[PDB]
Design a protein around this nucleic acid. Structure first.
Length: 1323
RNA sequence: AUAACUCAAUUUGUAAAAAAGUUUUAGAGCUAGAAAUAGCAAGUUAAAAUAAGGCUAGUCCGUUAUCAACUUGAAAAAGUG
DNA sequence: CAATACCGTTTTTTACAAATTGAGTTAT
DNA sequence: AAACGGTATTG
């Protein structure tokens, strides 16, 4: 009767198992529906659902936002053409049409094929005169002549279409007129102060050096080499760093506290410089106001590098510089190939397949791939000197439109747009009148805090209209309510107070929130001095004075400040011992001081009468980050403040939200006392009750008034947990298998459910970690030992680099060729913490350098290495967490309680995600109440970590080999049920920890020995029992036999979740034209034989069609049965009307009643038990699991790791004994592969390989057998190696055989099947 | 197990922007040759598209999540061994 | 028909909220 | 980032 369920919850599977009293897995007879002659079947109640990962919403979002970018850029051009429409119609009334049809081949074009002037002589003339658009852009900026309107339009349209970035705020004029002197205005402002060590400027060419072909980083070095007696990280070299753009320490420059890096482009900087200047005095911001005055020209230099006082179009002129240089260098490279290498010219200048010029210009070859190719050639010939200077500088044969124009800000483009408009407005009255309109098309940008400009058909939209009517760059302010919209952008994402759930949380930085924060910490500080019996609470008055004197004067108050500045001076004690605060108060009045600095007067802060004004100011400063909108919402308090001060508040932005509301903190009243929570936190007699105390006090009304304010789908519930969509898919399925297992078990609930649930890009972030950390350390280790990204995925090499080539425990340089002789020691030993992260790993010469094994590293070490752990910490080359764990011995180290804590974590699952899954299953199984209206827990939900079954597997030789088949998930769920239920039968004490719903030494020994009742020796007995109840928990000499027998059962229900495919219509590669039915038109009228198009559409699902086709001149109707793949693009027109769709495909007399949907993984059974899974309309997958006997699984396990005491005698002697298990396994793979795989040629290749490698070691043959299973695995054929032989995938490239096979519709567990024979439909 | 605070690190979800890439056309190829083909010249730029599309017609929406079969249901889901 | 092999859009920036993990403080 | 279905090309 009684039973339990076991579950193993992964991202790609749910393992499940039903067990009874004696840890047995029952079997039953299940109906078999359908049209076959089998009416029923025996099944074991063990199984696994397999499924493809749920994906994140990201890909979908980056597509969505780019789509919106595309539609808006189109609108940008359509705004400009609409302005030009009238006057364009008088110059050339087909001009906008010829442009829209530029894509179409001549035979589909309505107008003459030359787009700009609609004839060949004028178009050839345009290109000879304006080889690039930048040549035209410069001309229209500088020239004063009336221009052709078409030419005007094309220059503005290109600037509006490719308009650059919105990263810099406000206005940009090119100033490169005085980099030869701005530099020497700052050499003199710095040479007045440091008049006792003056810098020889020697009219040195700063114009060149700072702003060369080369970088910023280097360009500093090269300037400071040209200055005798100046450390390149000295005060002038530090300033000069900034004037480029880098963050120096500035710390030793002036010998202060911590590090005072700046950055002239960050907004922090106006306000930040007086953080350094309010240390060294206002007398030194003429050395920074001469170092902003060059922070300009250095900004623009790397793009522009053309004298700006001879063109208002420095950008286009720079582009023309690349065009001319490209022209010269190529006529030269051509001469120098002809005179010195002429046999190669065709390859370099005609062959597109090869990454020469032909490849660069007309093939698929990149600037990098081109440069890589001809460096050999260009140096394998003299004369090519100055050409190679450029190749190394990435200045050689540059295109104008390239990866690096990313840096160009929209303000540069706007400069030329403005210029051109000022020129031609003199001739074109419409341009003068619409100059501001046009400039606005380039400039306008929907604010991120407004979002889609929707009309309540966008699930993503939130913006509000003042006016129902079309939004435009021009009417935007008058029609969008930017304020309402900026607020919703935040409010629609923010929390409500969990205790008063209709009240919204306060801004984290609210003065009231911070008062709450401080008083809560402060009302539990307790002190003791001279002749006081015990330590006591602070009082009301005491807290007021401590708040008033200390908290309202310094960001941090320290325990020292509370001893020396308070108790010493007002309470007059010589020594005071305080408890509840260590070092400094976590809470602080951050906003109080921020606001004191900007509004001078403290009486205004301290005056309660105007608390509401002050809360609304910070709410404004939190809600918005647009200083305009701040200023607009702040000007209502401009009556109560100076001019100077509104310019300072306008700047004081804040970020973050509380967990609590104003109402809860300081509105709601204890009925009795009439006091708010904050009221109590300020003064609560001699009780000094906490926030969380007051919430839970029966003596007070807060507990029930909160109860009053409280308020009450599965799919919804799950999808709204915090966790990876991948793991959320596993969760929903496990809930659906549990629901099925209850139905099969007669709607009877289980006794218990035992869940356990598993734990270039990686290599580009690491390289970023490495580069930035060494830059911060200033270490030449990279020049000494250079590294490609992808070899930093070696754990020893990455740790070597993150350690600056040093032993992390000794202060000795590590030799980079000896990593082999070096240990990777865990910081917290693995014996306590199962963490394989870089966060708890370190590289050392000898692991023993750490100190003793049984703790965190030695104080001796910590003492000697510390200053070194904090260089790496300040460099991001370790995290605070690694740092805190390295140093821990100086704070005492690992307490016996700490160690016991960790041994518990290894067995007790604490992750919030797995707890919710338990809670869901508890709430769903336990729904019943008693006479007294108490919840009846009819079902215990039990949570294990994976270590328990992994240990139990290793400890009793129930080895998993993952790659034999999919059974191990099922197996794990079974072993969870048995270890689960057994464990709380032996120790009902542990329900505390495992069931939802000298004292450290004992705990420690207890949990590390908890699992001993399974073992016969450690002297303890066969039958094992519950002390109090006298229940049998484990027949140690029979219960292991039932576990061996269950794991041996060949018939385990494995189910691949069948799925309709969704996603991109096809691959995205826009292919060239080819004659081929495969190409898919990128638009209705673009025949892919003329225009190219898409390849490879995804089939959403396949559909069995029985119909007729026409054959012959005759069109005699011929019967067909086959699968047609319905593509994601097609699916919706196929569903609107199945018939019409198939009839358009060539089908007749379609039998509509035999159309079967066949989603991906649809399972078919053929001859001899052979099964196939549908991959697609014309591709199948391996649908069988190979049930290898357990004696072979174990042999493969141990064999494959001879790297395993007197226990390893029996282990290595079992392998050597049963070496003939090798042949017996090869034979099991071939009998399987011959009856079900049908890869005749691939089998011969594995057999020849096996027999050829027989004299090789057993270990090495077993590792290689484990590869051979990929031959046999369920799913898509895939390549594997045998030793050195590669066996390429034998693929199933037709679905015809399944048309006459048996379709098997499986329920989620596999227990219920509907079997269809398809030989019984096709006429 | 749970709440607030502090510090660090993660993960999820949203919006606003940028630069390329690719595709077709445009940018008169020249000269010998009956042609097959052979010499030389040339190249850096632009337009337009960037899921087909959709109706709600917005400067919106269009790749996430959810899916055995049978009956019921627009669906969500429920009933069926 | 089978064996064989090739291919696959990419980078970057700004603004924000939430939950989570894990080292501290105070509590239910 | 592979993995593995689309595609062509080869007899």
């Amino acid at each position: 009767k009684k039973y339990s369920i076991g579950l193993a919850i992964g991202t790609n599977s749910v393992g499940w198992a039903v067990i009874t009293d004696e840890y047995k897995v029952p079997s039953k007879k299940f109906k078999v529906l359908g049209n076959t002659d089998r009416h029923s079947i025996k099944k074991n109640l063990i199984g696994a659902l397999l499924f493809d990962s749920g994906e994140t919403a990201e890909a979908t979002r980056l597509k969505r936002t780019a789509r919106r970018r595309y539609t808006r850029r189109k609108n940008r051009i359509l705004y400009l053409q609409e302005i030009f429409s009238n006057e364009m119609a008088k110059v050339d009334d087909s001009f906008f049409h010829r442009l829209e049809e530029s894509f179409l081949v001549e035979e589909d074009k309505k107008h003459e094929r030359h787009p700009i002037f609609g004839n060949i002589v004028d178009e050839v003339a345009y290109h000879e005169k304006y080889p690039t658009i930048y040549h035209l852009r410069k001309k229209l900026v500088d020239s004063t002549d009336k221009a052709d309107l078409r030419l005007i339009y094309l220059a503005l349209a290109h600037m509006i279409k490719f308009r650059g970035h919105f990263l810099i705020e406000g206005d940009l004029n090119p100033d490169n007129s005085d980099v030869d002197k701005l530099f020497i205005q700052l050499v003199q402002t710095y040479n007045q102060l440091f008049e006792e060590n003056p810098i020889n400027a020697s009219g040195v060419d700063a114009k060149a050096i700072l702003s060369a072909r080369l970088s910023k980083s280097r360009r500093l070095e090269n300037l400071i080499a040209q200055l005798p007696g100046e450390k390149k990280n000295g005060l002038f070299g530090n300033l000069i760093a900034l004037s480029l753009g880098l963050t120096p320490n500035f710390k030793s420059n002036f010998d202060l506290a911590e590090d005072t890096k700046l950055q002239l482009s960050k907004d922090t900087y106006d306000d930040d410089l007086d953080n350094l200047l309010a240390q060294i005095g206002d007398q030194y911001a003429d050395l920074f106001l001469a170092a902003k005055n060059l922070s300009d020209a250095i900004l623009l230099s790397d793009i522009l590098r053309v004298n700006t006082e001879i063109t208002k179009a420095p950008l286009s002129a720079s582009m023309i510089k690349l065009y001319d240089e490209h022209h010269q260098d190529l006529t030269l490279l051509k001469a120098l190939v002809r005179q010195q290498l002429p046999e190669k010219y065709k390859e370099i200048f005609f062959d597109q397949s090869k990454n020469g010029y032909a490849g660069y210009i007309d093939g698929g070859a990149s600037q990098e791939e081109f440069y890589k190719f001809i460096k050999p050639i260009l140096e394998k010939m003299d004369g090519t000197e100055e050409l190679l200077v450029k190749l190394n500088r990435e200045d050689l044969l540059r295109k104008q439109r390239t990866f690096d124009n990313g840096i160009i800000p929209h303000q540069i483009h706007l400069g030329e747009l403005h210029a051109i408009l000022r020129r031609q407005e003199d001739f074109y009255p419409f341009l003068k009148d619409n100059r501001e309109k046009i400039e606005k098309i380039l400039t306008f940008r929907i604010p991120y805090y407004v979002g889609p400009l929707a009309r309540g058909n966008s699930r993503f939209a939130w913006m509000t209209r003042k006016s129902e009517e079309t939004i435009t760059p021009w009417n935007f302010e008058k029609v969008v309510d930017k304020g309402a919209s900026a607020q919703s952008f935040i409010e629609r994402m923010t929390n409500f107070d969990k205790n008063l759930p209709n009240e919204k949380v306060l801004p984290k930085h609210s003065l009231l929130y911070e008062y709450f924060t401080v008083y809560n910490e402060l009302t539990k500080v307790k002190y003791v001095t001279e002749g006081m019996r015990k330590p006591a609470f602070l009082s009301g008055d005491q807290k007021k004075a401590i708040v008033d004197l200390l908290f309202k004067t310094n960001r941090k108050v320290t325990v020292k400040q509370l001893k020396e500045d308070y108790f010493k001076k007002i309470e007059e004690f010589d020594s005071v011992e305080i408890s509840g605060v260590e070092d400094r108060f976590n809470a602080s009045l951050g906003t109080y001081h921020d606001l004191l600095k900007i509004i001078k007067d403290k009486d205004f802060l301290d005056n309660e009468e105007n608390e509401d004004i002050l809360e609304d100011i910070v709410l404004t400063l939190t809600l918005f980050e647009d200083r305009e909108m701040i200023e607009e919402r702040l000007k209502t308090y401009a009556h109560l403040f100076d001019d100077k001060v509104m310019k300072q508040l306008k700047r004081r932005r804040y970020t973050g939200w509380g967990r609590l509301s104003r109402k809860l903190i300081n509105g709601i009243r204890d009925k009795q006392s009439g006091k708010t929570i904050l009221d109590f936190l300020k003064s609560d007699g001699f009780a000094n009750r906490n926030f969380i105390q007051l919430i839970h006090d029966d003596s007070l009304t807060f507990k029930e008034d909160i109860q009053k304010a409280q308020v009450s789908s599965l799919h919804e519930h799950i999808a709204n947990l915090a966790g990876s969509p991948a793991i959320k898919k596993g969760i929903l399925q496990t809930v659906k298998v549990v629901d099925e297992l209850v139905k099969v078990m007669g709607r009877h609930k289980p006794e218990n459910i035992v869940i356990e649930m598993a734990r270039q890009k990686n290599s580009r972030e690491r390289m970023k970690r490495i580069e930035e950390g060494i830059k911060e350390l200033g270490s030449q280790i990279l020049k000494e030992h250079p590294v490609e990204n992808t070899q930093l995925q070696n754990e020893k090499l990455y740790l070597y680099y993150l350690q600056n080539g040093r032993d992390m425990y000794v202060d000795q340089e590590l030799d980079i060729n000896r990593l082999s002789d070096y240990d990777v020691d865990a910081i917290v030993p693995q014996s306590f913490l199962k963490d394989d992260s870089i966060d708890n790993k370190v590289l050392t010469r000898s692991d023993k350098n750490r100190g003793k094994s049984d703790n965190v590293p030695s104080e001796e070490v910590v003492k000697k290495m510390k200053n070194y752990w904090r260089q790496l910490l300040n460099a991001k080359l370790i995290t605070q967490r690694k740092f805190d764990n390295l140093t821990k011995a100086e704070r005492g180290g690992l307490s016996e309680l700490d160690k016991a804590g960790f041994i518990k974590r290894q067995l007790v699952e604490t992750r919030q995600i797995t707890k919710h899954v338990a809670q869901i299953l508890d709430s769903r199984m336990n729904t019943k109440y008693d006479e007294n209206d108490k919840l009846i827990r009819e079902v215990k939900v039990i949570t294990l970590k994976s270590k328990l079954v992994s240990d139990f597997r290793k400890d009793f030789q129930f080895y998993k080999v993952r790659e034999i088949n999919n059974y191990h998930h099922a197996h794990d769920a079974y072993l969870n049920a048995v270890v689960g239920t057994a464990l709380i039968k032996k120790y009902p004490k542990l329900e505390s920890e495992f069931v939802y719903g000298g004292k450290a030494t004992a705990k420690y020994f207890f949990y590390s020995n908890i699992m001993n009742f399974f073992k016969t020796e450690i002297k303890r007995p066969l039958i094992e029992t519950n002390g109090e109840t006298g229940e049998i928990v484990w027949d140690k000499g029979r219960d292991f036999a039932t576990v061996r027998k269950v794991l041996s059962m060949p018939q385990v229900n494995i189910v691949k979740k069948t799925e309709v495919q969704t996603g991109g219509f096809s691959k995205e590669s826009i292919l060239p034209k080819r004659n081929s039915d495969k190409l898919i038109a990128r638009k209705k009228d673009w025949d892919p034989k003329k225009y190219g198009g898409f390849d490879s559409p995804t089939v959403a699902y396949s559909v069995l069609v029985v119909a007729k086709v026409e054959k012959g001149k005759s069109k005699k109707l011929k019967s067909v049965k086959e699968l047609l793949g319905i593509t994601i693009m097609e699916r919706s027109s196929f569903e609107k009307n199945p018939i019409d769709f198939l009839e358009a495909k060539g089908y007749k007399e379609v039998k509509k009643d035999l159309i079967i949907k066949l989603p991906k993984y649809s399972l078919f059974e053929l001859e001899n038990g052979r099964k196939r899974m549908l991959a697609s309309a014309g591709v199948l997958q391996k649908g069988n699991e190979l049930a290898l006997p357990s004696k072979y699984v174990n042999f493969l396990y141990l064999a494959s790791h001879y790297e395993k005491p007197e226990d390893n005698e029996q282990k290595q002697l079992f392998v050597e004994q049963h070496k003939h298990y090798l042949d017996e396994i090869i034979e099991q793979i071939s009998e399987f592969s011959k009856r079900v795989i049908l890869a005749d040629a691939n089998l011969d290749k594995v057999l020849s390989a096996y027999n050829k490698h027989r004299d090789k070691p057993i270990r090495e043959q077993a590792e290689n057998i484990i590869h051979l299973f990929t031959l046999t695995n369920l799913g898509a054929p895939a390549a594997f190696k045998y030793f050195d032989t590669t066996i390429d995938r034998k693929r199933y490239t037709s679905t015809k055989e399944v048309l006459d096979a048996t379709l098997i519709h499986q329920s989620i567990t596999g227990l219920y099947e509907t079997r269809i024979d398809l030989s019984q439909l096709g006429g």
